[PDB]
Each structure stands twice: as C-alpha cells, then as structure tokens.
Amino acid sequence: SFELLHAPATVCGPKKSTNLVKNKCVNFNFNGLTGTGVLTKSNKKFLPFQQFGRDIVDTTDAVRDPQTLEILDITPCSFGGVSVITPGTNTSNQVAV
C-alpha cells in the first residue's frame, strides 16, 4: 500500500549506467540534469558537495558524474551559419560553402 502525499518519496526506480560516460564525440547527450551538448572530462575542482557548475550567465558548463567522481565540463554541440559562396548562376553553378 503506497504512500505519496507528504515529504518527498523514498521509493523509486530510475534507470542507471547508459555507458562509459562518453567523453568526447558530441554524444554524451545528458547527465543527471538533462543537458544536450558535447559532454567530456574537465579540470575543475567542485568543492566536494557541489555537483554542477554554472558560468557567469546561468548555463551549466560542468557536471560531476553521479556514480563516479568525474568532473565533466560540458560544451554545446556545434553550430554556425552555412553561407554559400557563388559566382552567380550566370557565370556558373558551382558553390563553395
């Protein structure tokens, strides 16, 4: 007979251990707190109760592995603007990108 009204639950069943946290290869696409980026190892010193780390503006660029110690700093996936260089469809139809 389950109990769920009062001070937060004790019993529950999260997953665990997807894999080998997946330092580089912009794959390590979550950690504890949901993140989506290139996620690998770092060299920070998280004050061993502190777990994740913001930058100057509230974006978490560091996290510690839960099951291990592993201060992993995260970095966003990649992006930019594909700009297309063309001689002009009157001259030719080849483009550099």
Binding site: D55, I56, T59, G81
Partner: protein, 87 residues
C-alpha cells in the same frame, strides 16, 4: 611599422591593441570569458579586413604622407624632401 615585431604594427599601434582588452566570441578555437555567448543562437562574424591589413593600409597613408606630402591623395604620389614638405 616595426619590422622586428611579427604583426608589423607600429610601436604605438601595439600600445593600442594591448590597452583595448577585447574578446572575439566567435572562436574557431575551442571559461575564458562570456565569449561562450556563441552558444545560444548568437554568433560573431569576423571583420572582413584583418587587423593585419588595417595596419597595412595605415603603413601606407603614413608612408605616402611622409614621402609625398598631400600629393598622393590627389593624383600620383610625387616625392618631396620632408623638411621641404614641412615648409
């Protein structure tokens, strides 16, 4: 311009690229600064003229105004001894 220096900037243009502590937030390079704004949909396109060029448009306009005077901005640069251009 200073020949010894790599950037070929004058001993005063160097006193100027050092004082203006700026940061290009569009690093093709991979915690330095807020330059990581580049990570939210924003980007910083690089200027068309690298500061190696701008500092070489200025070596001209400074080598033409020493060896020519005001002539090089009105036609072909015609040399003229400096202490006479100053007269």
């Amino acid at each position: 311009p200073d020949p010894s220096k790599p950037s070929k900037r004058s001993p005063i243009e160097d006193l100027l690229f050092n004082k203006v502590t700026l940061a290009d937030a569009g690093f093709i390079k991979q915690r330095d600064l807020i330059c990581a704004q580049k990570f939210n949909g924003l980007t910083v396109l690089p200027p068309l003229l690298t500061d190696e060029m701008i500092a070489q448009y200025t070596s001209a306009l400074l080598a033409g105004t020493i060896t020519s005077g005001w002539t090089f901005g009105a036609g072909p640069a015609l040399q003229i001894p400096f202490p006479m251009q100053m007269a």
